[PDB]
Amino acid sequence: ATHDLVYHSKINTFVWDVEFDIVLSDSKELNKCYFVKCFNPYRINGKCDFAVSSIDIFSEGKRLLIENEFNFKITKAVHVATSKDVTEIVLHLSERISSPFPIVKEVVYLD
Amino acid sequence: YDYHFEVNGTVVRHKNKGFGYMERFFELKESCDERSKLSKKQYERFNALFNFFEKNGVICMAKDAGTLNTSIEINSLAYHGKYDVMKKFIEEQSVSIEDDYKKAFFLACLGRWEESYDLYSNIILNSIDESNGCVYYLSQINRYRIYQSITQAVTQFNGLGLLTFGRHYKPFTDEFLARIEREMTNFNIDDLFNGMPFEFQKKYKILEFLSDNQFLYDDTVKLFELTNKVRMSSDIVVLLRLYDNLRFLYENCLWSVSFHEFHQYIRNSMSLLIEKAEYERTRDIDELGFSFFGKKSGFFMEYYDFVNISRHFKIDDIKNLERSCSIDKIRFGEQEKIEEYLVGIAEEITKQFSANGMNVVFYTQFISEAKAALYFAKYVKLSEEGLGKIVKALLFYFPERDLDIGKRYVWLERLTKCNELPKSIISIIDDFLVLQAEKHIQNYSEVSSNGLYSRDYGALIKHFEKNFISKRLSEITLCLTQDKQKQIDFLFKLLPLLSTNAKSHLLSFKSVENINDLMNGIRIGLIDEFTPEHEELIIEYLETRKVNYSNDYMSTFGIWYFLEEINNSKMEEFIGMDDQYDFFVDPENFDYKKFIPSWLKNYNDKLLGKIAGNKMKHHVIEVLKERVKNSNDKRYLEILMNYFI
Amino acid sequence: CSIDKIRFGEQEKIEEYLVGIAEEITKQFSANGMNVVFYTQFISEAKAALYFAKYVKLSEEGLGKIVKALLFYFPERLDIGKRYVWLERLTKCNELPKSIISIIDDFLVLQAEKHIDQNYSEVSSNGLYSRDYGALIKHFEKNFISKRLSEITLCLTQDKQKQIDFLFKLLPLLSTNAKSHLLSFKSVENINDLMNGIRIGLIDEFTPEHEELIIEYLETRKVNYIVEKNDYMSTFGIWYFLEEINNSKMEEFIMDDQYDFFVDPENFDYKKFIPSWLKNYNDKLLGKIAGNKHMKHHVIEVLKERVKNSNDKRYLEILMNYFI
């Protein structure tokens, strides 16, 4: 299950094809969603300078509108290949890295 | 093997142990009195031989070489992709069997594989006698190849297709498939050459390789000469051999030009050529001088190179070629012909989408070429009319299933690097934005892959024109009400484009109350101005966290303060909880032992430049130096070289 | 890449392979029999093996056999400079023991004996000559004096100039009586003697007469080559930039791109600067260049471009160690 794990050092992230059963803060529960990170250093911007990577959240295949992103309840990790539980590996990899989102599903390089 | 015919048009003697007939032929060609010592029959035969040799570009012997410069010229409508011309030519009644052969090849190139198979069968039936066996043999080969391609299309269209392409989309009927399977139940192509009359085998020996599974191993193996690092050249030899292969395969109307092996060979050849050219340029710069060589790579790129790269390359291969073989220093050649080719591509795309006569078999072949050509057209300077037509075709009539909104924006931004935005292109983009706004009126939402949406088009418009106002969008938002929320959100994403009165009328439909409202509004909408009351709201949030003393909120306000978007002394009262906030607020007193270099991987160009301009500089330089020395990381080295040096 | 940091396994088998290669080289070029066809194939493999052997750890006897085969029985058509480069590479991981020093001394004695006929001159493509060999010994043993060479020094007169020059090039290896006898026959006249003296260590401090020698050589070069429509000029510029010379006349001799770049850095056209020069400078000179202010903000840009474009790891090391 770890053979397909990839480390992308240009944005300090991990590519792993897993599903997150995250629980949004204040009792909101989400089913098997995931994340997608895009790396763009030439985007035209205004006052939102503090960004080179844009992170989108995909739930049930549809983009989730962000209102207050404070989910810190982890997730029952499910490897969609053959339905493995990899939650402990995920929680370890997350504490090991100071990045906001340590695990994504696909990274797009717009350089 | 009595002679060697070199690719530049020269002939040398290799194994001829008898009379040098070819030298005597050249001597007859050069002279005129010596030409006249022959009979009438021999004279006309010599004239025909002279015409053939001049047509095939055999110039002279090696000793008498003079002013040897070679230029390729392919005379096939299928190569240049003039689809309408071949469509018209198919309709006209044929005169001979060669016209039928050409019509069959054109039909195959246009995706009408059933008609092409039927025409090949008809040609096979008619032509069996008696000296035109070449046509019969080539027709057999092409018929087998089309059968193979139909089987493979069926294979990757029953599965990995259907709704995943849009509909079950049975390319051909089941009666045709059954007949095809029955007619080729045990066909073997390996014995096809050996069954021909012995005079055909003796004469047309050179066609035997057409009956083999692989026929390009010699050139692929020879491609190793372009990887030598030891200081005509191999570049010219390889390029001329490639042109020769392409011309032979396209002028004789052979269907092997559409298989994976040929595409792979073309890709390998072109990529290796460009790699060798770039490496030679780098070596010359290293030894000779910084600019004595001129820094201009010697690989001149012409119309045919652009056509080959467009046709035979995927997007990922072009991306690799760009990454490893920097192209901006490679200058393109003939630009008018390239512009005409791109305009033809755009017109064909427009015709295919508008007429709704989508040919599912032809679509798969054509769309990859269209995408590659539009991706590679960044380095070509285009006139106003061609650019307008290309932009219109790309934005409006390009199918959504292959180019979502983000990829379309990427293509458009690429097209504007070497050409910039004139008024007409801005008008076209404004029309596209208006159409999208009308489309948003619902159970509708945009889908993108790279994370770029309609806001970026307006951002680019404002980047190229600071004083642009969309009158149609202003009229759209003036009639807007509070019922349709998504339209208000979409117009918010395009806030700066609207007029002042439209802006004031639009503000009535959304206001900010809490810190969530502030962060969300600045995040997606535009609240660039930081009013004191919004600042007070942030101060309330910070006080709440202070007394209460986990995702990211505080570092955002710290960076905003460091960028002087917020000006107040209360920020110094919130030092201690989040180290990044302290670093961005109080740099002089910050304990750099807590600094982690990974923070430098999340800042854009402007923030990094502003950090480089603040003196904090030396500690960051030390951290980056240590990081580069320990682990050879390319991002850290790039940042340090670009901004801190 | 950096191959020396890659772990190497099965050292004894590689040592046996190299010993076999050396024995075959000895066989093919000693007993008056050289297979002309087989030589073309075998020499390339032998040269590649002896070049690549710098990363492998070797024992005493294998190293001795390899060094003997490389120095003595390897065909000349490997010159002296290439042989020295190969030997220096060999010595990196297998620091010179005494027996290899004895073998090198034997080679030097043979070369000195060869220097009798007044038509024998070492031809080195790179520019490294037999003299450098002696320096290598002095790089590992300060108190080494060649007993055999002293005998040749003592029994020498003023008649044979080539022997005098050759032994002058290898002066430090001789004994006190040998040095006293040799110095009685040779002076520090002209340019080559001055360069050999400063390299060896006779002339600790430059003297005015050597300055006049330099000045007249520059005048002759100016009026003979450029006026009339190579490393010496670069060496003189290096000496001046290190403040070793105290004359302003040489500033009027501005030609050699390197000469212009060194004596007159402010007005030098940096478009003519090539980066390869930066690979031929030692630590102190690079530090001094980093200390200058008219040279830093162009050399740094050249290094930035070289790091961005080239595939060489030396430029990045130079940039990170000294200029930043």
mmCIF file with all atom_site columns, N, CA and C in Angstrom, chain B residues 132-170:
data_model
loop_
_atom_site.group_PDB
_atom_site.id
_atom_site.type_symbol
_atom_site.label_atom_id
_atom_site.label_alt_id
_atom_site.label_comp_id
_atom_site.label_asym_id
_atom_site.label_entity_id
_atom_site.label_seq_id
_atom_site.pdbx_PDB_ins_code
_atom_site.Cartn_x
_atom_site.Cartn_y
_atom_site.Cartn_z
_atom_site.occupancy
_atom_site.B_iso_or_equiv
_atom_site.pdbx_formal_charge
_atom_site.auth_seq_id
_atom_site.auth_comp_id
_atom_site.auth_asym_id
_atom_site.auth_atom_id
_atom_site.pdbx_PDB_model_num
ATOM 1   N N  . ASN B 1 132 ? 1.047   -3.466 -63.235 1.00 0.00 ? 132 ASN B N  1
ATOM 2   C CA . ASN B 1 132 ? 0.730   -2.604 -62.104 1.00 0.00 ? 132 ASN B CA 1
ATOM 3   C C  . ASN B 1 132 ? 0.554   -3.388 -60.811 1.00 0.00 ? 132 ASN B C  1
ATOM 4   N N  . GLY B 1 133 ? 1.261   -4.510 -60.661 1.00 0.00 ? 133 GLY B N  1
ATOM 5   C CA . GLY B 1 133 ? 1.169   -5.294 -59.443 1.00 0.00 ? 133 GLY B CA 1
ATOM 6   C C  . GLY B 1 133 ? 1.590   -4.538 -58.202 1.00 0.00 ? 133 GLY B C  1
ATOM 7   N N  . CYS B 1 134 ? 2.321   -3.433 -58.370 1.00 0.00 ? 134 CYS B N  1
ATOM 8   C CA . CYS B 1 134 ? 2.654   -2.586 -57.233 1.00 0.00 ? 134 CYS B CA 1
ATOM 9   C C  . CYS B 1 134 ? 1.397   -2.042 -56.566 1.00 0.00 ? 134 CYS B C  1
ATOM 10  N N  . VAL B 1 135 ? 0.425   -1.602 -57.368 1.00 0.00 ? 135 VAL B N  1
ATOM 11  C CA . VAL B 1 135 ? -0.830  -1.101 -56.814 1.00 0.00 ? 135 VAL B CA 1
ATOM 12  C C  . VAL B 1 135 ? -1.556  -2.204 -56.057 1.00 0.00 ? 135 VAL B C  1
ATOM 13  N N  . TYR B 1 136 ? -1.588  -3.410 -56.624 1.00 0.00 ? 136 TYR B N  1
ATOM 14  C CA . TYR B 1 136 ? -2.241  -4.539 -55.967 1.00 0.00 ? 136 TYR B CA 1
ATOM 15  C C  . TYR B 1 136 ? -1.585  -4.856 -54.626 1.00 0.00 ? 136 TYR B C  1
ATOM 16  N N  . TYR B 1 137 ? -0.253  -4.888 -54.597 1.00 0.00 ? 137 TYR B N  1
ATOM 17  C CA . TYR B 1 137 ? 0.473   -5.196 -53.369 1.00 0.00 ? 137 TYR B CA 1
ATOM 18  C C  . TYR B 1 137 ? 0.230   -4.131 -52.304 1.00 0.00 ? 137 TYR B C  1
ATOM 19  N N  . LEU B 1 138 ? 0.346   -2.858 -52.690 1.00 0.00 ? 138 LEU B N  1
ATOM 20  C CA . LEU B 1 138 ? 0.134   -1.779 -51.734 1.00 0.00 ? 138 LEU B CA 1
ATOM 21  C C  . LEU B 1 138 ? -1.298  -1.774 -51.220 1.00 0.00 ? 138 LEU B C  1
ATOM 22  N N  . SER B 1 139 ? -2.262  -2.085 -52.089 1.00 0.00 ? 139 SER B N  1
ATOM 23  C CA . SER B 1 139 ? -3.652  -2.148 -51.656 1.00 0.00 ? 139 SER B CA 1
ATOM 24  C C  . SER B 1 139 ? -3.862  -3.262 -50.641 1.00 0.00 ? 139 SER B C  1
ATOM 25  N N  . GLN B 1 140 ? -3.255  -4.430 -50.870 1.00 0.00 ? 140 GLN B N  1
ATOM 26  C CA . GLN B 1 140 ? -3.348  -5.504 -49.883 1.00 0.00 ? 140 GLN B CA 1
ATOM 27  C C  . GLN B 1 140 ? -2.804  -5.050 -48.535 1.00 0.00 ? 140 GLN B C  1
ATOM 28  N N  . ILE B 1 141 ? -1.623  -4.427 -48.550 1.00 0.00 ? 141 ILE B N  1
ATOM 29  C CA . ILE B 1 141 ? -0.988  -4.010 -47.302 1.00 0.00 ? 141 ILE B CA 1
ATOM 30  C C  . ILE B 1 141 ? -1.864  -3.000 -46.570 1.00 0.00 ? 141 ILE B C  1
ATOM 31  N N  . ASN B 1 142 ? -2.361  -1.996 -47.296 1.00 0.00 ? 142 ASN B N  1
ATOM 32  C CA . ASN B 1 142 ? -3.171  -0.958 -46.671 1.00 0.00 ? 142 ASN B CA 1
ATOM 33  C C  . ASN B 1 142 ? -4.474  -1.525 -46.126 1.00 0.00 ? 142 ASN B C  1
ATOM 34  N N  . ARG B 1 143 ? -5.078  -2.473 -46.844 1.00 0.00 ? 143 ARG B N  1
ATOM 35  C CA . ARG B 1 143 ? -6.303  -3.094 -46.360 1.00 0.00 ? 143 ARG B CA 1
ATOM 36  C C  . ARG B 1 143 ? -6.059  -3.829 -45.048 1.00 0.00 ? 143 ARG B C  1
ATOM 37  N N  . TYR B 1 144 ? -4.952  -4.569 -44.964 1.00 0.00 ? 144 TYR B N  1
ATOM 38  C CA . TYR B 1 144 ? -4.635  -5.254 -43.713 1.00 0.00 ? 144 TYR B CA 1
ATOM 39  C C  . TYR B 1 144 ? -4.410  -4.258 -42.581 1.00 0.00 ? 144 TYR B C  1
ATOM 40  N N  . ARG B 1 145 ? -3.704  -3.160 -42.865 1.00 0.00 ? 145 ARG B N  1
ATOM 41  C CA . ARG B 1 145 ? -3.435  -2.175 -41.820 1.00 0.00 ? 145 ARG B CA 1
ATOM 42  C C  . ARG B 1 145 ? -4.723  -1.526 -41.327 1.00 0.00 ? 145 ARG B C  1
ATOM 43  N N  . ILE B 1 146 ? -5.654  -1.244 -42.239 1.00 0.00 ? 146 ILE B N  1
ATOM 44  C CA . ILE B 1 146 ? -6.920  -0.644 -41.833 1.00 0.00 ? 146 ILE B CA 1
ATOM 45  C C  . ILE B 1 146 ? -7.737  -1.632 -41.009 1.00 0.00 ? 146 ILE B C  1
ATOM 46  N N  . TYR B 1 147 ? -7.687  -2.917 -41.366 1.00 0.00 ? 147 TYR B N  1
ATOM 47  C CA . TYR B 1 147 ? -8.328  -3.932 -40.535 1.00 0.00 ? 147 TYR B CA 1
ATOM 48  C C  . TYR B 1 147 ? -7.758  -3.922 -39.120 1.00 0.00 ? 147 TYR B C  1
ATOM 49  N N  . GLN B 1 148 ? -6.430  -3.853 -39.008 1.00 0.00 ? 148 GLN B N  1
ATOM 50  C CA . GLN B 1 148 ? -5.805  -3.818 -37.688 1.00 0.00 ? 148 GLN B CA 1
ATOM 51  C C  . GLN B 1 148 ? -6.245  -2.589 -36.900 1.00 0.00 ? 148 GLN B C  1
ATOM 52  N N  . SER B 1 149 ? -6.276  -1.429 -37.556 1.00 0.00 ? 149 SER B N  1
ATOM 53  C CA . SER B 1 149 ? -6.665  -0.207 -36.864 1.00 0.00 ? 149 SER B CA 1
ATOM 54  C C  . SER B 1 149 ? -8.123  -0.246 -36.428 1.00 0.00 ? 149 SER B C  1
ATOM 55  N N  . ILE B 1 150 ? -8.992  -0.869 -37.226 1.00 0.00 ? 150 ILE B N  1
ATOM 56  C CA . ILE B 1 150 ? -10.399 -0.983 -36.851 1.00 0.00 ? 150 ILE B CA 1
ATOM 57  C C  . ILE B 1 150 ? -10.554 -1.903 -35.648 1.00 0.00 ? 150 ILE B C  1
ATOM 58  N N  . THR B 1 151 ? -9.840  -3.033 -35.655 1.00 0.00 ? 151 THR B N  1
ATOM 59  C CA . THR B 1 151 ? -9.885  -3.923 -34.502 1.00 0.00 ? 151 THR B CA 1
ATOM 60  C C  . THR B 1 151 ? -9.427  -3.204 -33.239 1.00 0.00 ? 151 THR B C  1
ATOM 61  N N  . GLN B 1 152 ? -8.327  -2.447 -33.325 1.00 0.00 ? 152 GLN B N  1
ATOM 62  C CA . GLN B 1 152 ? -7.844  -1.749 -32.136 1.00 0.00 ? 152 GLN B CA 1
ATOM 63  C C  . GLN B 1 152 ? -8.803  -0.657 -31.677 1.00 0.00 ? 152 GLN B C  1
ATOM 64  N N  . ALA B 1 153 ? -9.439  0.049  -32.613 1.00 0.00 ? 153 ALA B N  1
ATOM 65  C CA . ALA B 1 153 ? -10.433 1.040  -32.221 1.00 0.00 ? 153 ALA B CA 1
ATOM 66  C C  . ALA B 1 153 ? -11.595 0.380  -31.499 1.00 0.00 ? 153 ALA B C  1
ATOM 67  N N  . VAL B 1 154 ? -12.099 -0.730 -32.043 1.00 0.00 ? 154 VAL B N  1
ATOM 68  C CA . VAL B 1 154 ? -13.130 -1.497 -31.348 1.00 0.00 ? 154 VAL B CA 1
ATOM 69  C C  . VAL B 1 154 ? -12.668 -1.865 -29.946 1.00 0.00 ? 154 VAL B C  1
ATOM 70  N N  . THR B 1 155 ? -11.412 -2.301 -29.819 1.00 0.00 ? 155 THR B N  1
ATOM 71  C CA . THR B 1 155 ? -10.902 -2.741 -28.523 1.00 0.00 ? 155 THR B CA 1
ATOM 72  C C  . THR B 1 155 ? -10.899 -1.607 -27.505 1.00 0.00 ? 155 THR B C  1
ATOM 73  N N  . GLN B 1 156 ? -10.453 -0.415 -27.900 1.00 0.00 ? 156 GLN B N  1
ATOM 74  C CA . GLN B 1 156 ? -10.438 0.703  -26.963 1.00 0.00 ? 156 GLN B CA 1
ATOM 75  C C  . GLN B 1 156 ? -11.664 1.596  -27.112 1.00 0.00 ? 156 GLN B C  1
ATOM 76  N N  . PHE B 1 157 ? -12.742 1.066  -27.679 1.00 0.00 ? 157 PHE B N  1
ATOM 77  C CA . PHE B 1 157 ? -14.013 1.784  -27.702 1.00 0.00 ? 157 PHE B CA 1
ATOM 78  C C  . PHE B 1 157 ? -15.184 0.995  -27.133 1.00 0.00 ? 157 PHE B C  1
ATOM 79  N N  . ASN B 1 158 ? -15.115 -0.334 -27.053 1.00 0.00 ? 158 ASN B N  1
ATOM 80  C CA . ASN B 1 158 ? -16.096 -1.054 -26.249 1.00 0.00 ? 158 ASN B CA 1
ATOM 81  C C  . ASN B 1 158 ? -15.829 -0.835 -24.768 1.00 0.00 ? 158 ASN B C  1
ATOM 82  N N  . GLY B 1 159 ? -14.547 -0.858 -24.394 1.00 0.00 ? 159 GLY B N  1
ATOM 83  C CA . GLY B 1 159 ? -14.167 -0.563 -23.000 1.00 0.00 ? 159 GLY B CA 1
ATOM 84  C C  . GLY B 1 159 ? -13.365 0.724  -22.965 1.00 0.00 ? 159 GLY B C  1
ATOM 85  N N  . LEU B 1 160 ? -13.170 1.304  -21.777 1.00 0.00 ? 160 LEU B N  1
ATOM 86  C CA . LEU B 1 160 ? -12.447 2.600  -21.663 1.00 0.00 ? 160 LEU B CA 1
ATOM 87  C C  . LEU B 1 160 ? -13.070 3.595  -22.655 1.00 0.00 ? 160 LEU B C  1
ATOM 88  N N  . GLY B 1 161 ? -14.404 3.665  -22.696 1.00 0.00 ? 161 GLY B N  1
ATOM 89  C CA . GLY B 1 161 ? -15.100 4.584  -23.618 1.00 0.00 ? 161 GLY B CA 1
ATOM 90  C C  . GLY B 1 161 ? -16.565 4.685  -23.249 1.00 0.00 ? 161 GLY B C  1
ATOM 91  N N  . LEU B 1 162 ? -17.461 4.613  -24.237 1.00 0.00 ? 162 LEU B N  1
ATOM 92  C CA . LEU B 1 162 ? -18.904 4.623  -23.965 1.00 0.00 ? 162 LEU B CA 1
ATOM 93  C C  . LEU B 1 162 ? -19.228 5.947  -23.284 1.00 0.00 ? 162 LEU B C  1
ATOM 94  N N  . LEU B 1 163 ? -19.819 5.954  -22.086 1.00 0.00 ? 163 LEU B N  1
ATOM 95  C CA . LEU B 1 163 ? -20.137 7.213  -21.424 1.00 0.00 ? 163 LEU B CA 1
ATOM 96  C C  . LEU B 1 163 ? -18.879 7.961  -21.001 1.00 0.00 ? 163 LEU B C  1
ATOM 97  N N  . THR B 1 164 ? -17.786 7.244  -20.728 1.00 0.00 ? 164 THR B N  1
ATOM 98  C CA . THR B 1 164 ? -16.537 7.918  -20.401 1.00 0.00 ? 164 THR B CA 1
ATOM 99  C C  . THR B 1 164 ? -16.030 8.768  -21.558 1.00 0.00 ? 164 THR B C  1
ATOM 100 N N  . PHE B 1 165 ? -16.487 8.500  -22.782 1.00 0.00 ? 165 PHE B N  1
ATOM 101 C CA . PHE B 1 165 ? -16.282 9.411  -23.899 1.00 0.00 ? 165 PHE B CA 1
ATOM 102 C C  . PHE B 1 165 ? -17.516 10.269 -24.146 1.00 0.00 ? 165 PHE B C  1
ATOM 103 N N  . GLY B 1 166 ? -18.684 9.820  -23.680 1.00 0.00 ? 166 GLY B N  1
ATOM 104 C CA . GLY B 1 166 ? -19.912 10.583 -23.804 1.00 0.00 ? 166 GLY B CA 1
ATOM 105 C C  . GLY B 1 166 ? -21.142 9.771  -24.168 1.00 0.00 ? 166 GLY B C  1
ATOM 106 N N  . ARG B 1 167 ? -20.956 8.706  -24.946 1.00 0.00 ? 167 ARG B N  1
ATOM 107 C CA . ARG B 1 167 ? -22.041 7.810  -25.328 1.00 0.00 ? 167 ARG B CA 1
ATOM 108 C C  . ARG B 1 167 ? -21.407 6.516  -25.822 1.00 0.00 ? 167 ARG B C  1
ATOM 109 N N  . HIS B 1 168 ? -22.174 5.420  -25.756 1.00 0.00 ? 168 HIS B N  1
ATOM 110 C CA . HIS B 1 168 ? -21.724 4.104  -26.204 1.00 0.00 ? 168 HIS B CA 1
ATOM 111 C C  . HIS B 1 168 ? -20.966 4.206  -27.522 1.00 0.00 ? 168 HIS B C  1
ATOM 112 N N  . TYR B 1 169 ? -21.473 5.026  -28.445 1.00 0.00 ? 169 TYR B N  1
ATOM 113 C CA . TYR B 1 169 ? -20.749 5.433  -29.649 1.00 0.00 ? 169 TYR B CA 1
ATOM 114 C C  . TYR B 1 169 ? -20.117 4.232  -30.354 1.00 0.00 ? 169 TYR B C  1
ATOM 115 N N  . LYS B 1 170 ? -20.980 3.339  -30.810 1.00 0.00 ? 170 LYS B N  1
ATOM 116 C CA . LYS B 1 170 ? -20.501 2.225  -31.613 1.00 0.00 ? 170 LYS B CA 1
ATOM 117 C C  . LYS B 1 170 ? -19.937 2.778  -32.915 1.00 0.00 ? 170 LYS B C  1
#
